[PDB]
Every structure is written in structure tokens, then in C-alpha cells.
Design an enzyme around this catalytic site. Structure first.
Site, PDB file in Angstrom:
ATOM      1  N   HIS A 185       0.699  -1.046  -0.200  1.00 45.53           N
ATOM      2  CA  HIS A 185      -0.017   0.108   0.007  1.00 45.53           C
ATOM      3  C   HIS A 185       0.914   1.303   0.014  1.00 45.53           C
ATOM      4  O   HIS A 185       0.751   2.031  -1.086  1.00 45.53           O
ATOM      5  CB  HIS A 185      -0.699   0.079   1.500  1.00 45.53           C
ATOM      6  CG  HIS A 185      -1.906   1.000   1.344  1.00 45.53           C
ATOM      7  ND1 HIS A 185      -2.858   1.232   0.642  1.00 45.53           N
ATOM      8  CD2 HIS A 185      -1.675   2.568   1.760  1.00 45.53           C
ATOM      9  CE1 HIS A 185      -3.557   2.142   1.091  1.00 45.53           C
ATOM     10  NE2 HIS A 185      -2.889   3.128   1.580  1.00 45.53           N
ATOM     11  N   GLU A 186       1.720   1.218   0.670  1.00 41.89           N
ATOM     12  CA  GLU A 186       2.856   1.938   0.964  1.00 41.89           C
ATOM     13  C   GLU A 186       3.291   2.432  -0.184  1.00 41.89           C
ATOM     14  O   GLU A 186       4.122   4.226  -0.520  1.00 41.89           O
ATOM     15  CB  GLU A 186       3.905   2.387   2.213  1.00 41.89           C
ATOM     16  CG  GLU A 186       3.953   3.649   2.555  1.00 41.89           C
ATOM     17  CD  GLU A 186       2.464   4.318   2.756  1.00 41.89           C
ATOM     18  OE1 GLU A 186       2.696   5.556   2.769  1.00 41.89           O
ATOM     19  OE2 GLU A 186       1.179   4.092   3.449  1.00 41.89           O
ATOM     20  N   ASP A 241      -4.948   0.825  -3.084  1.00 44.97           N
ATOM     21  CA  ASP A 241      -4.757  -0.188  -2.459  1.00 44.97           C
ATOM     22  C   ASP A 241      -5.192  -1.014  -3.747  1.00 44.97           C
ATOM     23  O   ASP A 241      -4.563  -2.726  -3.699  1.00 44.97           O
ATOM     24  CB  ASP A 241      -6.139  -0.067  -2.085  1.00 44.97           C
ATOM     25  CG  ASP A 241      -6.382  -0.303  -0.792  1.00 44.97           C
ATOM     26  OD1 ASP A 241      -5.639  -0.420   0.061  1.00 44.97           O
ATOM     27  OD2 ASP A 241      -6.988   0.299  -0.024  1.00 44.97           O
TER      28      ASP A 241
HETATM   29 ZN    ZN Z   1      -2.351   4.878   1.969  1.00 45.54          ZN
END
Ligand code: ZN
Ligand code: ZN
EC number: 3.4.-.-
Lengths: 416, 418
Positions: free
Chosen positions: B93-94, B141
Site C-alpha cells: 500500500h505504501e 489499494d
Molecule cells: Zn494510504
């Protein structure tokens, strides 16, 4: 033959180390053997190597036995006003060996153990060997010739003899030195004549003598062998050598009494003048390690001029490495040391400490075995080597070494 | 150059992070997190910069990233991560925030320091704060789940982890700090659950390094809610055998932390006997050994290690063993080569400073600790140490030319930012 008495001499030395209170100080045993070998250097009909042992005993006495093994009581240092007098006692003992006086006394004779028990009793502070007046007449005549060839004062022998007679002529029980070495007036008179007959020689006691006296009386305190401040106050007014030794003596007692800060600044002027002197370097390491300044003790000894040649410096630096938490460096020195000085139990014990810190257990057990072998406890040493030999692979090189050394110790047992 | 500016803007913030945030600089944990992170980056699209992954000693769960591919993960992530694929989903995600340049594109609308102050407030246990648009979070996502899958992790872990964050957002008065930088409305979740449902079903097992990393993080760097509980240790004693070796490893750590070294040595033995060559227990095997001043034993074991040439964890462990053993030169031989091969590793420089200090090479000691201060953003202080170093060597020597040259480089870093 000669091979047996050298081997019998080793046996008496081993049980002497195991029970008599020998002084094992590096500086002292190095000095007394250096002075003794200097006299052997000028002796005739020398058929054996020579070793000189120092015993912490305030009763003055001296004796020798097979294998050129001379035993000197530490009290000789307080009786000897100069180095030539102390050498006068050694040349006397040395002549007892080259003439083989005790050897022939034991040729006219459980017999080895009978003499071993006597030699051990004479050494310990608490049936004694005595020499005939003929043996003693020869021991003085030949002894004074060894002493002149060695560059000391021949008159030191009669002044010493007269010193002890003047003190013990009237005593119900004289010192033990006069029981082993009977000194009638006739023997004194002849000693003074032969000294008068050769040339006058005024020699100054070496610097090393005055500091050997200070350390002997200082660190190996016991009983009447204290170094009273009376001698230090007197040496403070004496010659250039006695005043330095006087201040070395009290720097020594300051360190003995844990007055480490007092000891450093007391030793301060002597170390600056002779920064490569073993006596001053030795004491400086004692003070540094007493204040948990192991690094400072290491750096000083690493810069020592003759660290690579002087056994006193090697032992001091090896021990400093140990207190400094560097067992490996200590082992590197002690492995070289213990093979260059196989009979030095100080080397073997320090190596044992280093090998323990390194967790090389078979090598530690091997080093511990040597200390026990030198002290006459051959069974115990054999036991340790058996443990060491059991922690190495069968057929390995180390196992062959330990097994081979066990054979040497076992064979040394069956001779007696 | 934007990528050039971003990379040194990132270096500036990373240096400020080292100097004031409580980062975990442990070799095993940093090597694992970056090995896991790089495995994700290597499957990400349009990666234009190197990536580094940092670990904070913070019991509040959060994760964020900024310029230069630098992502920051709080140690609380190991408390919330039941499996390796959940932790990977947060890093995926990061990682997607960076590849999409979300933080960079949000800032085009005193300002360099304004962002840096926000970054450390979120990382420090002392908490402005950044927030992404819920559109931004959908791209992270969407792209993160595909990096998650190509990397061989469970795609259902991402929605499963999101739902565990939501069950604490109403069953607890405290909104976890991660949900404020990364907001989680049910649309975000239902979008995530849908995507995972449409990929391939994949049951994946967490690596053995994950459980050991989770154990060391919570056991050795315990802090606040970041504990290695006896309830979890006993739970790991019943799970798969990976969790049992990890559970044994965790109690050996806590036995060592409480100075019960022989209790810890005897607990660690069976795991070392099975795996004599893996760095995790080798690391603690030396730790307990030196706790009892048995430095030789630690050295002998590490010289018999297979991958000593390739594993930095092994290289530092032996250098430290040489130092405690009293052979600083053997430590310096390792560390001189180590620091040159890992110039950004402050553990290497600090150990080199120790070795050079024990050798009484004072100029080289000052230069080694100068690098530690440069990595921590203390550039004025690094310059002071190299000034002292340069004053102890003859002028015209290369040591002087090299110390003075390094001062020149640090001054350029200094003037680029105020
Ligand atoms: Zn985020
Ligand atoms: Zn006699």
C-alpha cells in the site's frame, strides 16, 4: 654418575617447590641467578648447570646439593651490607658443589628420601646437614678465588665471617648458618689472611643489588625480614644508588598498602630518569593494575626497550593483557614464554589463566599440569594431561603430544 | 531535476529521522524489512528511485512514505500483523503511494521544514499530520494488491487487515493513527474485498523470518502496547512448528533481557542445533556468549559460518565479538571493508569508531564517529569532528586532504537546505 645427580637434583628441586616457601618473583630470581651465574662464570671444574633458589625464611642459612642447585634464605639480604658479601656466601656454596662435598659425604653412606626430608626441613622456617672443617676450609679458599675473578671485593668474605661471628660467638644457639657452616676462629683467621694476600679492590655494589634488597625486604615481608624504615632512612643519606633504592622501597610499601596514588608520585622521579629499567617498569604495572588502569600499563610495557628480550617485562605485559581483557595477546606471549622458560611456574600459571579465558580447555589443563609437575605432584599432572588427551581426537597431533608428555612424567616417576 | 531533488529531499528527511526519531537499527530486523520491501518493489510498476524501509519504536500503528522511495513503518505493525501477507499488504500500500507520487503531487499546491516537522510528529511517540484523498487510497489499494499478488502473498490479506483496523475504530475510543493518514470508509473496504475476491484463491504460509522478526520486535524492542505476551507465546507453542521455534526464540530473548543468560543459552540450544547456519539464532548465540564474557566462543562460531562474506548481520556480529574479545584490529579489518560496502549503516561506523579508539588511532576514530553524526543530520557536529581529525595529521598528507574533502561534501549537503 653425573647424569643421576643432575636428575636427583631435579627431584629435590621439585619437592622443594612443592612444600618449601620459595620466592617466585621474576625480578628477584632473575637477579640472584644472574649474580650466581656470574660467579659460576669464573669457577673451575664446573660439571653441571647451576640454578639459585630464594626462600622466604628470616633465619639466615645457605646450602647446596646435586645438580648445581643452590638454596639461599631471604635473610641473607638483610645480613649482606654490600653485594660482594652476598656473593661471598654464594661462591662458598658454589665451591661446595664443584668439590662435590655433599656428594662424597653420601658416597660413604630410602636414602634419597632421607636426605630430601632433611633438605626440606632446612628450607622451611619450621637432623640437619653439616660440613666438616676441611670441606669448609676448601670452600673458603676456592670460594674467595671465584669471587676475585668475578670482579667483587675479596675482603667481603672475612668481614662477613667476622660480622656473623661477632654476633653469634656468645649465643647459646647461633643462627642456623653456623650449624651447617661451622665458623671457629681458625677458619676465620685463615679467611682473613688469604684476603689480605691478594690485591685490594674497592667495588661499588651494583644498582640491582640495592633494589633487590629493597624488594626482598619490602614485598616479601615476614617476621624479622621486614624492611624497617631504619634502613630506608639510612639509605636516604647514602650513595646515589642507595637513595634511589630507598625511594623505590617506600614506593613499594605504598603500593603494598593500596596507597596507589601515593605510590605513583613516589616512583615518579625514578621512572623518568630510567624509563627502561625493569624494576621501575615492574612496579609501575603493579600500581596501574591496582587502579584498574590496565590499558595504561599495557601501553607503557609495549614501548619498553627490551620487552622482546627481558623475561620480567614479558610476564608483566602478559598479565596486563589478562587484566585488560585481551587473553589472546597474553596467550601469544605466554606460549612463547613457557617454551623459552620451561621451569618457570609463573609462565605456566599465567598461560593456564589465558587459556581458561579463551576456553581452550585441553590447553588449559596442559598448562595446569606443568605447574603440578614442577611442584613434584607428578600423579596430579599426569591426571590433568589424561583429561586433556581425552578431549582431542584419537590419532590427532595434540593427543600424541599429551600422551608423549605423560610418558615423560611417568618415566620420571619410576626413577624414584 | 525532479527525481534528483526528490532523492536528496528524501535524504534530508531520512537524516532528520535518524537524529530525532527512535528507529530500530538492529541488523536482523532492518535486513528483513528491507528484504521483504525490496521483494515488493521489484514487482512494482514504474519504480524510478531506490527504496528504503525504516522501522520506528512506536506502539501506535501507522505507515507513511515520502520522496526518494523512503517508507516508514511503526513497530506496532508486527502487533497487528497475524501473517506476513498482511504486513506485506501495508508495505505494498505504501509502496504504491510513492510510485504514484501522491505525496509529491499533493505538495505542488519554510515549506521543506513544514513537511519535515509533520513527518517526525507522526513517527515519534509524541504526536500536524498528512492525509491522502480517498481517491489516492483507492489507487494505493488497487495497485498495492497487484504488487501483493505478483510477489506471492495472499491477496485476501489486504481486506482482512483493513477489517481488523475497522473493528478497533468503533470497539475502541481511540482511532489508530494509521486510519487518519490513511482513512478507511466502508467503501474503501468493500472495494478492497471485491478485488481480492476476483483474484485467484491463494493460501500462503508466512516465512520463518516473519515470526522471528515479530518475536524480536516485540520481545527485544518492547514498548507500551508492543509486548511479547505470554498469551501469544503459548499460542505460538500450539501452532505450526515455525511459530514454535519463534516462541522458543522469544523466551530466550526475554531470559537474556533479564540477564538469565544460562537460562537463555539452554533454551536457544535446540534451535541452533537444527539450524546451525542461520543468522537469527547465531545473532543471539553471540549475545548470550558476550553477556558471560565468552567472546572467544562467539568468535569461533562465527568464523565457521558459511555466509560470513555475504551476510552483514554475521559481519557485524563477529566485529563486535572481536572488540569484546580484545582484538580491535581484527574488528577494524572487518569494519573498514564493511563501512565502505554499507556507507549508510550507522552500526558499522559506530563499531569502527570503537575499534579505532581501542587502537589509539584518534584521527580515524573521529572520522568514523563523524559519519555517525552525518547520518543523523548533525552535519555541524560531523564537521567539528573532521576538523579535529584534520588538525591531528600533517598538512599535505592525504588524511588531511581526505578529511578536509569530506568536510567540503558535508558543507554542500548543508547549503542545499537553508
Ligand atoms: Zn494510504
Ligand atoms: Zn660451608
Amino acid at each position: 654418575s653425573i647424569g643421576q645427580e643432575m636428575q636427583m637434583g631435579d627431584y629435590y628441586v621439585r619437592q622443594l617447590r612443592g612444600s618449601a616457601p620459595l620466592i617466585n618473583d621474576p625480578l628477584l630470581t632473575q637477579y640472584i641467578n644472574s649474580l650466581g651465574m656470574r660467579l659460576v662464570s669464573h669457577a673451575n671444574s664446573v660439571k653441571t648447570p647451576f640454578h639459585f633458589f630464594l626462600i622466604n625464611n628470616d633465619e639466615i642459612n645457605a646450602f647446596a646439593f646435586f645438580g648445581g642447585n643452590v638454596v639461599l634464605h631471604s635473610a641473607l639480604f638483610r645480613y649482606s651490607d654490600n653485594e660482594s658479601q652476598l656473593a661471598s656466601v654464594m661462591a662458598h656454596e658454589i665451591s661446595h658443589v664443584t668439590q662435590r662435598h655433599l656428594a662424597r659425604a653420601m658416597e660413604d653412606q630410602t636414602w634419597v628420601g632421607a636426605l630430601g626430608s632433611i633438605l626440606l626441613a632446612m628450607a622451611s622456617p619450621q637432623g640437619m646437614i653439616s660440613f666438616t672443617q676441611q670441606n669448609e676450609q676448601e670452600a673458603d679458599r676456592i670460594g674467595i678465588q671465584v669471587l676475585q675473578r668475578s670482579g667483587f671485593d675479596p675482603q667481603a668474605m672475612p668481614t662477613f665471617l667476622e660480622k656473623l661471628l661477632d654476633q653469634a660467638r656468645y649465643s647459646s644457639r647461633p643462627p642456623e648458618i653456623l650449624l651447617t657452616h661451622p665458623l671457629p676462629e681458625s677458619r676465620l683467621a685463615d679467611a682473613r689472611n688469604r684476603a689480605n694476600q691478594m690485591r685490594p679492590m674497592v667495588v661499588q655494589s651494583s644498582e640491582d643489588f640495592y633494589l633487590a634488597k629493597a624488594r626482598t625486604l619490602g614485598m616479601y615481608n615476614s617476621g624479622r625480614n621486614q624492611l624497617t624504615s631504619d634502613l630506608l632512612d639510612e639509605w636516604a643519606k647514602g650513595n646515589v644508588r642507595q637513595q634511589r633504592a630507598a625511594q623505590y622501597g617506600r614506593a613499594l610499601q605504598a603500593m603494598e598498602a593500596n596507597k596507589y596514588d601515593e605510590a605513583r608520585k613516589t616512583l615518579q622521579p625514578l621512572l623518568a630518569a630510567e624509563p627502561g629499567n625493569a624494576w621501575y617498569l615492574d612496579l609501575a604495572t603493579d600500581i596501574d593494575l591496582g587502579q584498574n588502569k590496565a590499558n595504561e600499563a599495557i601501553n607503557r610495557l609495549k614501548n619498553a626497550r627490551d620487552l622482546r628480550t627481558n623475561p620480567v617485562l614479558q610476564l608483566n605485559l602478559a598479565n596486563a593483557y589478562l587484566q585488560g581483557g585481551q587473553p589472546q595477546e597474553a596467550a601469544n606471549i605466554l606460549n612463547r614464554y613457557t617454551f623459552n622458560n620451561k621451569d618457570d611456574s609463573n609462565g605456566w600459571d599465567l598461560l593456564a589463566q589465558a587459556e581458561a579465558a579463551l576456553n581452550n580447555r585441553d590447553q588449559e589443563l596442559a598448562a595446569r599440569a606443568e605447574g603440578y609437575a614442577l611442584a613434584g605432584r607428578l600423579d596430579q599432572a599426569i591426571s590433568l594431561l589424561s583429561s586433556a588427551s581425552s578431549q582431542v581426537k584419537l590419532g590427532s597431533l595434540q593427543q600424541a603430544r599429551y600422551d608423549a608428555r605423560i610418558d615423560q612424567l611417568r618415566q620420571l616417576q619410576e626413577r624414584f
